[PDB]
Amino acid sequence: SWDSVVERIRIFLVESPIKMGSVKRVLLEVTSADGIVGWGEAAPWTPEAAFSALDIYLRPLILGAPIKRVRELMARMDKMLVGHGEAKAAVEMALLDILGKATGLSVADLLGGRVRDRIPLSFSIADPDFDADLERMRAMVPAGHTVFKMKTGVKPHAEELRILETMRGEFGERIDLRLDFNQALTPFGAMKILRDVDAFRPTFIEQPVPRRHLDAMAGFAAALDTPILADESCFDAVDLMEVVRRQAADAISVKIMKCGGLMKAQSLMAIADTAGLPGYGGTLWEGGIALAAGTQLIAATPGISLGCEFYMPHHVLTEDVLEERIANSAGHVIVPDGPGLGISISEASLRGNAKIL
Amino acid sequence: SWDSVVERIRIFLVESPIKMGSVKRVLLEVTSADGIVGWGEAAPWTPEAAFSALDIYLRPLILGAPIKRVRELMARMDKMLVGHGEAKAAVEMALLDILGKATGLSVADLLGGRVRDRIPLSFSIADPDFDADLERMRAMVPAGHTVFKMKTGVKPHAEELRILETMRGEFGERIDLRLDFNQALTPFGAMKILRDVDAFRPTFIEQPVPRRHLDAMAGFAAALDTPILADESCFDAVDLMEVVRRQAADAISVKIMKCGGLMKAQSLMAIADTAGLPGYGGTLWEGGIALAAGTQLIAATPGISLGCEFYMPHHVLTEDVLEERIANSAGHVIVPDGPGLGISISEASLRGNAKIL
Amino acid sequence: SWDSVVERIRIFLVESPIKMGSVKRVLLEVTSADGIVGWGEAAPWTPEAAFSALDIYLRPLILGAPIKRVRELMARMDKMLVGHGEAKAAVEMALLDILGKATGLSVADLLGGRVRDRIPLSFSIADPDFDADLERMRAMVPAGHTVFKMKTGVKPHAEELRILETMRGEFGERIDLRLDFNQALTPFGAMKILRDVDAFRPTFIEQPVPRRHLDAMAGFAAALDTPILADESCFDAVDLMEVVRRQAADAISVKIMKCGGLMKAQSLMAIADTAGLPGYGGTLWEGGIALAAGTQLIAATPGISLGCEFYMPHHVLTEDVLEERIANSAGHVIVPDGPGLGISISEASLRGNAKIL
Amino acid sequence: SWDSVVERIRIFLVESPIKMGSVKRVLLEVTSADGIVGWGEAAPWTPEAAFSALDIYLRPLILGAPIKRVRELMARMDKMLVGHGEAKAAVEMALLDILGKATGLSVADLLGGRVRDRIPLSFSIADPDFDADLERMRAMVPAGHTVFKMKTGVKPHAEELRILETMRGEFGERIDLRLDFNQALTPFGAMKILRDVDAFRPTFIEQPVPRRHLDAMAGFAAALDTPILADESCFDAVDLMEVVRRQAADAISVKIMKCGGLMKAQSLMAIADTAGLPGYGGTLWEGGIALAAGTQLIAATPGISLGCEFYMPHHVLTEDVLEERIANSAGHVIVPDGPGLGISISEASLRGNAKIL
Ligand SMILES: [Mg+2]
Ligand SMILES: [Mg+2]
Ligand SMILES: [Mg+2]
Ligand SMILES: [Mg+2]
Ligand SMILES: [Mg+2]
Ligand SMILES: [Mg+2]
Ligand SMILES: [Mg+2]
Ligand SMILES: [Mg+2]
């Protein structure tokens, strides 16, 4: 029978290299009274904000807290501080890492158990040189990649239509093709654009207009066969209840840190499953600790059936603090095996692959 | 790192004594490939139904199943069989018992952790001789009982009003008083009745009319300050979404087996928390195994904040198959400590306290 | 630190020449206690009405009023007199002209600052001889005109369709083509007409039916991809809230004097921006003073993004009282530079270019 | 004719003393190419967040920007950065300070002109020792204080009722009494509480339940004569449109920095005026620069007719960087006179009254 309390934390502001460059990351190391270590990462969606949140506001809540009572601590952190979802999620992550390691269970195991072992990984089609992208697809489809997301509303509409025509002409339904307008359309004049791309039967169209325009989003969903997916229209459980009530979307992207962590993401998905709205894992931060957390969540959350994608594939994380990277192959992320988050971090791996501020 | 599969089951039809008499109960014993035993109980809300369900329909799904993948198995059982929520919940119960014992965790721990250690237990006020009941209250309030539920719509309305007047005159707000009409009112003529008892400010009024009359229930909630609690109007997540949409209740009773188990009850409560509807634990079956399951659920589910009550207090379970009983004292159930469900069952305890059919 | 009061006014009823002729215009000259002069113009949408309004009803409100407190004076004029929006707007115009000249600021500057320096100017296509119009377009598109508005519902529907076909055949999307039915359609039988012209993807269709038929207008908007623009359905902020609530239009034309002035037009557009409805500057009166006011407003009001047009291009204002005309070139009005309204009016310019009644 | 660009900024993180202690504040000094200085302050509702926002994200937008084009710059800052409303509002504040000083106009003048010269200031009644508070009221009412806000839902309901009875017994309608539950009620059981305090006819009841529960808030408003005021339910124009649509409140508190600045607050109030919802100035930060901004806004925004209050009166700002403090007397804030914000800050006043980090 395992019971133990948090004994100390270390908060690290680290710099990590990318190539498209630098990015800063907040990592939290929690250590129990019986010696077991767990890691969390606060990924924004300003790292100084998160960094201070943990160091001053949340520190006296973490310290002493019983590690088996994660939901209880999250309710304490939400009562004392308002809306630092990223920092709170790093604490939850780390406590679940510890609890998992102490009991021989993964985080997925502690969230109802795995329902899948791999997660479809979307490949972004966003190259100004479409021919460059076509050859990538030409190699990737035979290698088992099926999920592609085309950035749309960037080139003249006619050109984007010819591109979609070329893609459906070669691949037909062998690709699971999604479109993303990145909120760039206005409700005025969006419908002719959306109706044109709806003829190619994309699996979904992501958030064509900004967060406010729920009636416009409901209008699109009502007129179009193609599923409309809410991203910025749905951050949390409250937004989701309004999306359902207005029928403003057919699917939602789940943002572990926008919604406020792993348990909150599963609560969100209970609503969505009842309402018949599939979830998409959204943009996962490539930082190994936050990515491990997201992969475990999705592994244990059957309604998140639309796969996932990386924060911005066009700039890849070159060195990380994990002893071993979370792996992807043939169009899917491999859900790391092993207790807790299923990752390891040593002093050397940390202080030798990131510059500590 | 623990991983193991179900290796065998035994299904027992048992007779157990009561005093107001006999009742029949379906108990399931599951045993893993690494020797660890877990128990579940199917409590109706006909035991032959449940008994056959486990023995023929569900047996080939249980056998071989990985015990860490509880949600995955529940999705298999719902796909292959429709609407035997009781039998499926006994399987889940037992797998969580095993998983808990294998890892040193309670079932609450595996459901996000405890958020409470005791559960307020409602005392039913239903004696035709009210003076008998008044003396009971006279002793119980000083002993720490606060929660009382009066059965109403049984004696002439005037008499029930004089009773409520006597109760508020002595106790005021020192008692948390609830009323239950047991669906006995009709939508025609209910409002004058309900308005009269609303003046005594009960904590809630339970399901005054049958399940169908959601508009009537919404009508009551709209006219009355007193919270209306849905019982038979809300069995599952689907009912709850309609209750929210119609604003047909202010609170719901959660039926672990009506809704389809422990994880389904927590999904139900994610919807209810977002919607601002508190949960009540409803009528818990006194059979020790099902009661342990219900107590763990409520221990780990913060939105179920209205306490609980026993199936029918007027007939108490005289001997049970547990080595030690789940305990209540001073108006609350004590959430049993220890791994899994936190109960033990030996061959002797089973075959010497229940008659096996 | 500038502070000053209105010291006197002169109200002028003037006759001005046109060619298709005469029109009468109400001009107001306000003069501060520190000598600075400002002009306003009341443009109907009977000039005797406006003329008396200023001379008797509003005169005792203007006189003495602090010129820095424009919104305060407008609230006084709305409290004492009901619904002479034109005359009140001339007072506001003039006070902002004075305030601007006193401080070295334009009217746009006093309304949050310019967000644009030119305003797209719509060219009306309304010639019975379409070939005459086609040659005009043939010259104007290469000269930088993009915005065209076709009067529709005037020639037999078949002929209007062949015209639209010829226009899209030559110009494609190189023209921003709008259609205007001038309220001539009835809700009975409008939808087949509107669906036919919707295939040519006009940028918007203006007020196909009269003001009353908001459900009909909402019906059109719901069935058609093409934006429906409200004109006579939306005069003021109150109408706009109902248009939004009923989703009766996708865009609105803002009538500076119908809505009750420059500040009221910006309040109207705050609602419309939140609701995702772009504004169109509507029909601007060519009288230089009112036109300067409208151009400043639009310059400072980013949501009015659909351009503007002149009251009736088929009859042009031949001589005006401005020392220099507001200029348009290559399909856009040039927002006049300089303090206040950015226009000048001398005794000679006034008494030598208009006949004073 | 004045035109000029921003030439440089200085961002200061300062510590300021209070007494109930320390607080940190972000102050921004902007300087034009023609030498004129303006100040802004970012008041949270973590100062490191705001501090970095200005220094790295917003700095290249501010530098070079034309000071007459405030709305244009705000649209640039909202396009490049998402949701740092505090930091953006400090930039707007400072540019309006400069523009005002350059032209001899106050910020109110640039926002349509003053409509009032004083702002009713609410006095918080929150002392556990009510008798202490009663004597304060006894002195303050004869001195001209009329506006009082009682914190409610803190002492037992019965005691709060006796307090309200004593207050109405002495003062009757000579006090403008407001109640604030600080979101402490739950939708379950709130109505009996609210109905009890509604009998004392408070001017309004502020946000009795958390932000999510809009249907509950609409329920309260529908059942009660007393106005319900939205605070956390209404941050911005988008929330307000939903509040209006659901009729979830009768009045709103306007948060200059929650809504995203001074112009955004006036846009918000155009919606609210049309909808018949009065505004309340909410909790103003006592830091002199942010307070000057809030006072100018309210001075120029007639719909904010419910007065204002200070962030937390129980801890007063002991020394500030203003040469002279914004003044209050006899229950009202005096809107500071003079160009721009109407405040001055020297090197000595700044570096001698706050500790610079
Ligand atoms: Mg659809
Ligand atoms: Mg997105
Ligand atoms: Mg009610
Ligand atoms: Mg019941
Ligand atoms: Mg439409
Ligand atoms: Mg028109
Ligand atoms: Mg009301
Ligand atoms: Mg508040």
TrEMBL record, chains A, B, C, D:
<dbReference type="GO" id="GO:0016854">
    <property type="term" value="F:racemase and epimerase activity"/>
</dbReference>
<feature type="binding site">
    <location>
        <position position="224"/>
    </location>
    <ligand>
        <name>Mg(2+) 2</name>
    </ligand>
</feature>
<dbReference type="Pfam" id="PF13378">
    <property type="entry name" value="MR_MLE_C"/>
</dbReference>
<dbReference type="Pfam" id="PF02746">
    <property type="entry name" value="MR_MLE_N"/>
</dbReference>
<feature type="binding site">
    <location>
        <position position="232"/>
    </location>
    <ligand>
        <name>Mg(2+) 1</name>
    </ligand>
</feature>
<dbReference type="InterPro" id="IPR029065">
    <property type="entry name" value="Enolase_C-like"/>
</dbReference>
<keyword id="KW-0413">Isomerase</keyword>
<dbReference type="GO" id="GO:0006518">
    <property type="term" value="P:peptide metabolic process"/>
</dbReference>
<dbReference type="InterPro" id="IPR013342">
    <property type="entry name" value="Mandelate_racemase_C"/>
</dbReference>
<dbReference type="InterPro" id="IPR036849">
    <property type="entry name" value="Enolase-like_C_sf"/>
</dbReference>
<feature type="binding site">
    <location>
        <position position="206"/>
    </location>
    <ligand>
        <name>Mg(2+) 1</name>
    </ligand>
</feature>
<feature type="domain" description="Mandelate racemase/muconate lactonizing enzyme C-terminal">
    <location>
        <begin position="130"/>
        <end position="227"/>
    </location>
</feature>
<protein>
    <submittedName>
        <fullName>Muconate cycloisomerase</fullName>
    </submittedName>
</protein>
<dbReference type="InterPro" id="IPR029017">
    <property type="entry name" value="Enolase-like_N"/>
</dbReference>
<dbReference type="GO" id="GO:0000287">
    <property type="term" value="F:magnesium ion binding"/>
</dbReference>
<dbReference type="InterPro" id="IPR013341">
    <property type="entry name" value="Mandelate_racemase_N_dom"/>
</dbReference>
<keyword id="KW-0479">Metal-binding</keyword>
<comment type="similarity">
    <text>Belongs to the mandelate racemase/muconate lactonizing enzyme family.</text>
</comment>
<dbReference type="InterPro" id="IPR018110">
    <property type="entry name" value="Mandel_Rmase/mucon_lact_enz_CS"/>
</dbReference>
<feature type="binding site">
    <location>
        <position position="231"/>
    </location>
    <ligand>
        <name>Mg(2+) 1</name>
    </ligand>
</feature>
<feature type="binding site">
    <location>
        <position position="221"/>
    </location>
    <ligand>
        <name>Mg(2+) 2</name>
    </ligand>
</feature>
<dbReference type="GO" id="GO:0009063">
    <property type="term" value="P:amino acid catabolic process"/>
</dbReference>
